[PDB]
Every structure is written in structure tokens, then in C-alpha cells.
Amino acid sequence: PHLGEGGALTGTARKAEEARLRRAEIERQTELGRLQQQIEQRRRRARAQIEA
Amino acid sequence: PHLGEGGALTGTARKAEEARLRRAEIERQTELGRLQQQIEQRRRRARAQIEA
Hints:
This is part of a larger assembly, with two copies of chain A (52 residues). Helices cover 75% and strands 0% of the residues of chain A. The first copy, chain A, has one helix at 13-51. The longest helix of chain A has 39 residues, at 13-51. Chain A is rod-shaped, with a radius of gyration of 20 Å. The N and C termini of chain A lie far apart (61 Å). The chains hardly touch. The PDB classes it as circadian clock protein. Keywords: autokinase, circadian clock protein.
């Protein structure tokens, strides 16, 4: 079965919870990259203000 | 004689010019110190703003 998750989904529902979790993993990775981008740009803006 | 601006004077006029130069030098040095302190405090202000 699918131990641990919200029940031991078996077939179809298992194949759907797997897809949900995989899409969520990809989404979290995209979010981490996005956040790195944002904090880097904000840090550069702050450096510019400090130089000013 | 007293060699400088105004001539030799040679008397209480010499004393007057000497006292004028003395007071003026003290005034200049006090102004220099005032401006140095202003610069130092504004520098503290800007460094603290950068830290903020």
C-alpha cells in the first residue's frame, strides 16, 4: 500500500496521490529558485542604496 | 616694526592689530573644530543609516 500518507490508497488513487506529490515537489523547487532570485535582487537594491 | 597687513603701527595700534590677529586665529581654529565635529557626527549618522 501507500503507507504514511492520508490512507493506504491502492491503484488509481495511489497513482493520483503520486502525481500530486511529484507536482508539489516540482512546485517547491520552482519556489526555491524564485525566492533565491528575489532575495538576490533585493540585496543588490540594498547595496545600491548603501552606496548612495 | 610689525610687518604685515596695515603697516608697522608701532604702538597701541600694534597691540590692537596683534590682539585682532590673535582673536581671529582663535576664531578660525574654533570654526575648524566645529566643522570637523559636524562632519564626524554626520558620518556617524550615515554609517548608522547604512546599518539600518
